[PDB]
From a paper:
The HD transcription factor WUS plays key roles for plant development with at least four distinct and essential subfunctions: Firstly, regulation of stem cell identity in the shoot apical meristem (SAM), where it is required for non cell-autonomous induction and maintenance of stem cell fate via stimulation of cytokinin and suppression of auxin signaling. Consistent with a broad functional portfolio, WUS has been shown to bind to a diverse set of DNA motifs in the regulatory regions of downstream genes involved in SAM development and signaling processes. Here, we have combined molecular, biochemical, and structural approaches to address how the WUS-HD recognizes specific DNA target sites.
The overall WUS-HD fold reflected that of a canonical HD structure, consisting of a three-helix bundle with an N-terminal arm. Interestingly, superposition with the structure of Engrailed (En) (PDB code 3HDD23) and comparative sequence analyses identified unique structural features in WUS-HD. Loop region I is slightly longer compared to other HDs and is characterized by a distortion at the end of helix α1. Loop region II has an even longer insertion, which also extends helix α2 by an additional turn compared to En. Furthermore, this docking residue is shifted by one residue relative to the conserved DNA-contacting arginine (R38) in contrast to three residues in canonical HDs. Electrostatic surface calculations showed a large positively charged surface formed by the C-terminal recognition helix (α3) and the N-terminal arm, which represent the most conserved part of the HD.
Numbering used by the authors: 39 to 103
The structure:
Amino acid sequence: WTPTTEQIKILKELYYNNAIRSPTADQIQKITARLRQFGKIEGKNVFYWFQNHKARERQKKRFNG
């Protein structure tokens, strides 16, 4: 799975406007339903997108990050 550009923009809006980091399972279902209007996507793709960003935040907080 690779998000479409529009899906990425929506995911970043949720991440930076709502400050979502670890959505509930109900949130993942609702987010997936909206993202599906812009292309293929499954709920686990949303779960892992937020998980991958947690790892990226940890990298940005290291000395050489």
